[PDB]
A paper describes a structure:
High-resolution crystal structures demonstrate that the miniproteins bind Ras as a dimer and interact via a distinct binding mode that captures the Ras effector domain in an open conformational state, which can be stabilized by insertion of a proline at Asp-38 in Ras.
To test this, we recombinantly expressed the 225-1 Y7C miniprotein (which we named 225-11) in Escherichia coli and found that it spontaneously formed a disulfide-bonded dimer that bound Ras more strongly relative to the same miniprotein reduced with 2 mm dithiothreitol (DTT). The non-disulfide–linked 225-1 and 225-3 miniproteins failed to afford diffraction-quality crystals with KRas, but the disulfide-linked 225-11 miniprotein afforded a crystal that enabled us to determine the structure of the KRas/225-11 complex to 2.1 Å. This structure revealed a disulfide-dimerized 225-11 miniprotein bound to KRas in an extended, open conformational state in which the switch I loop and β-strand 2 of the effector domain are peeled away from KRas by the invading miniprotein dimer, exposing one face of the bound GppNHp nucleotide. The KRas-miniprotein contacts occur primarily through the α-helix of one miniprotein protomer (“primary protomer”) and β-strands 1–3 and switch II of KRas. Key miniprotein-Ras contacts appear to include miniprotein residues Glu-15, His-18, Glu-19, Trp-21, Trp-25, Asn-26, and Tyr-29 of the primary miniprotein protomer along with His-18 and Trp-21 from the “secondary” miniprotein protomer. The miniprotein dimer itself appears to be stabilized by the disulfide bond and by hydrophobic packing at the interface between protomers.
Numbering used by the authors:
A (entry chain A): 2 to 166
B (entry chain B): 4 to 32
C (entry chain C): 2 to 32
C-alpha cells in the first residue's frame, strides 16, 4: 500500500526540513549536486510496510487549479505551524478549510504538527495546540526538525489516521 | 525539474520520479 | 495499460502535468 502525504503550513514553519529529516536523516545543509532529492520512503508502521510519497508544498499560497489537483491526490495532511509563530498557528484553521474544500469532505485524515520545539522562543503553548487538535478530533504531535524529535511519529501517526478512513 | 526516468526504468523508478514531479509541478505554479 | 512517455527538454508545464496524470493512471493500473 502506497500513501500520499501532503505537508502544509505557513511560510518558514519547517515543512521542507521535516520532509528532509524523514527521508534523509539530517538537518544541516548537505552539498550533493550528483543526486536529485527524494520524496519517497519505504517504512514499516505497526507491523505493516508502506511506501510514502510526500508533497512538500510551498509556503507561498495562491489560486491554482493544478495545485488543487496536486493536493486532491493527497490522502492525509500534516498541518504544520511553528511554536515560535503565533500567526502560523492561527493560520491552521484556514489550512484545514482549504483541505476540506479541495477534498469535498469534512472527513479527511489530518495531524497537527507544532514544529521548532527545540527553540528558546516559544510563543504557542502545548496545551493551546492540544485543544485546537481536540476541537478538530485529530492528533497533535510536537516536533523539531533540528533534533529529529517527533518527526517519525508525525508522519506515522498520519498514516495511522489514513488506516482508520 | 526532475530528469526523465528512462526506458529501462522499473515501476519503483517511476514512482520515485512521480513523487519528484508532484513536488516540482506544485512548486512552480 | 500503456506506459506514458516522459516529454523532452522543450515541453510545457502543462505537458509535464499531463505526464504526471498519465503516470499516476499507469502506476495505479499496474499495482
Ligand atoms: N531551530 C529549528 N529550525 C528549523 C526547524 N525546522 C525548520 N527550521 C528552520 O526554519 C527555516 C525555514 O525552514 P524550511 O524547512 O524551509 O521551512 P518551510 O516551511 O519549507 N519554508 P517555505 O514555507 O518558505 O517553503 C530554516 O532556517 C530552517 O533551518 C526546527 O525544528 N528547529
Ligand atoms: Ca543521509
Ligand atoms: Ca495561479
Ligand atoms: Ca503562481
Ligand atoms: Mg519549503
Amino acid at each position: 500500500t502506497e500513501y500520499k502525504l501532503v505537508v502544509v503550513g505557513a511560510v518558514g514553519v519547517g515543512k521542507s526540513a521535516l520532509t528532509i529529516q524523514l527521508i534523509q536523516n539530517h538537518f544541516v545543509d548537505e552539498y550533493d549536486p550528483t543526486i536529485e532529492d527524494s520524496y519517497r520512503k519505504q517504512v514499516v508502521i505497526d507491523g505493516e510496510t508502506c511506501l510514502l510519497d510526500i508533497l512538500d508544498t510551498a509556503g507561498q499560497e495562491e489560486y491554482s487549479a493544478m495545485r488543487d489537483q496536486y493536493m486532491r491526490t493527497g490522502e492525509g495532511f500534516l498541518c504544520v505551524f511553528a511554536i515560535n509563530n503565533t500567526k502560523s498557528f492561527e493560520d491552521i484553521h484556514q489550512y484545514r478549510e482549504q483541505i476540506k474544500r479541495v477534498k469535498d469532505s469534512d472527513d479527511v485524515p489530518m495531524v497537527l504538527v507544532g514544529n521548532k520545539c527545540d527553540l528558546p522562543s516559544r510563543t504557542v503553548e502545548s496545551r493551546q495546540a492540544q485543544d485546537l487538535a481536540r476541537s478538530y478530533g485529530i492528533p497533535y504531535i510536537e516536533t523539531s526538525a533540528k533534533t529529529r524529535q517527533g518527526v517519525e511519529d508525525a508522519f506515522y501517526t498520519l498514516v495511522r489516521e489514513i488506516r482508520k478512513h | 525539474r526532475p530528469r526523465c526516468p528512462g526506458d529501462d526504468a522499473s515501476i519503483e523508478d517511476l514512482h520515485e520520479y512521480w513523487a519528484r514531479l508532484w513536488n516540482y509541478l506544485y512548486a512552480v505554479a
